[PDB]
Amino acid sequence: GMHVDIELPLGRATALQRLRAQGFCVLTPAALETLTGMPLDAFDMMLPYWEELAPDLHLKDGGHYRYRRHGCFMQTLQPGQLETVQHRAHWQPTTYNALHGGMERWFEPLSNEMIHLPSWSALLVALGELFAKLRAPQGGRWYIEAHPFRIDTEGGVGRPTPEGAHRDGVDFVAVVFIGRQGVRGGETRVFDAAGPQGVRFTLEQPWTVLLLDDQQVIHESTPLLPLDPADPAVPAHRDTLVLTYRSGGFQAPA
Ligand SMILES: [Cl-]
């Protein structure tokens, strides 16, 4: 099988061995603290922004209601720096073989206050430094997109993704579990992209992080189901943060 390190904290060197060997690993909240040098209280400062995400009104597929925001960055590895870049669209071609065309989506920008938190930079930088140890990006630069999400069961019906498991068309992905209430389901699955092996596990502790080598694994999560569907007024949602890292540039039409 494959290792789901969801109970014990991985150090950076073990996390690297895991990503090389199986193409993903899980960092417990304690492992994230150790990796980033930031205590969990500093990460908690980000939580109120998940109450202010913008509705994503682009799809009308009868799925659960989606809220999000979007922001992009460039990380330089030596000398280390992280900087914002101008707000930009997110590309969604029907295939990562696409050179041109496809859908470009404008979302609302991340809160400026959130991106100036110490934990925000600590998070993006530490993960970039880790990922560059597996596969160094061209010119020592990562192009990073951040997608904070809330999926709310107050409306819509959750169904399996038509496409099944996906990759993101980048080099590395981090899925950070931010929180959840009033729901079950939302189980993550990670599969070997070139073999039959897979794992299932449910992220439950805030600041648990799933690290993915986007060229070696594919992933998905199962639909949410309200714990108390009989009662509307009880909040029922799941919060995540998806960070993508890409060499060369942001995914974009030529
Ligand atoms: Cl690609």
Q: Is 63 helix (H, G, I), strand (E, B) or coil?
A: coil
User: Is the Cβ–Cβ distance between 234 and 199 less than 8 Å?
Assistant: no
- Rounded Cα gap, residues 151 and 155, in angstroms: 10
Distance 145 CA to ligand 1 centre (A): 15
Domain that holds residue 213: 1-254
Distances from the Cα of 48 to the Cα of 97, 178, 253, angstroms: 38, 11, 34
Distance 218 CA to ligand 1 centre (A): 13
Distance 168 CA to ligand 1 centre (A): 8
Residue 13 neighbours by CB under 8 Å, 6+ apart: none
User: Is the Cβ–Cβ distance between 241 and 148 less than 8 Å?
Assistant: yes
Residue 73: what are its φ and ψ, rounded to 5°? -150, 165
- Rounded Cα gap, residues 38 and 120, in angstroms: 10
Own/partner long-range contacts of 106-110 (Cβ < 8 Å, ≥24 apart) = 107/54, 107/56, 107/68, 107/69, 107/70, 107/147, 108/53, 108/54, 108/68, 108/69, 108/70, 109/69, 109/70, 109/71, 110/49, 110/69, 110/70, 110/71, 110/146, 110/148
Q: Quick one: residue 96, left, alpha or beta (phi over 0 = left, psi -120 to 50 = alpha)?
A: alpha
Distance 118 CA to ligand 1 centre (A): 31
- Rounded Cα gap, residues 134 and 161, in angstroms: 30
For position 31, which CATH number holds? 2.60.120.620
Closest CA to 23 of 187, 203, 171: 171
DSSP 175-202: EEEEEEESEEE--EEEEETTSS-EEEE-
Distance 161 CA to ligand 1 centre (A): 21
How many Cβ atoms sit within 10 Å of the Cβ of residue 253? 13
Distances from the Cα of 136 to the Cα of 14, 24, 132, angstroms: 18, 17, 4
Number of domains in the chain: 1
Distance 95 CA to ligand 1 centre (A): 9
Angle, CA 50 vertex, CA 87 and CA 59 arms, to 5°: 65
Distance 253 CA to ligand 1 centre (A): 12
Distance 41 CA to ligand 1 centre (A): 36
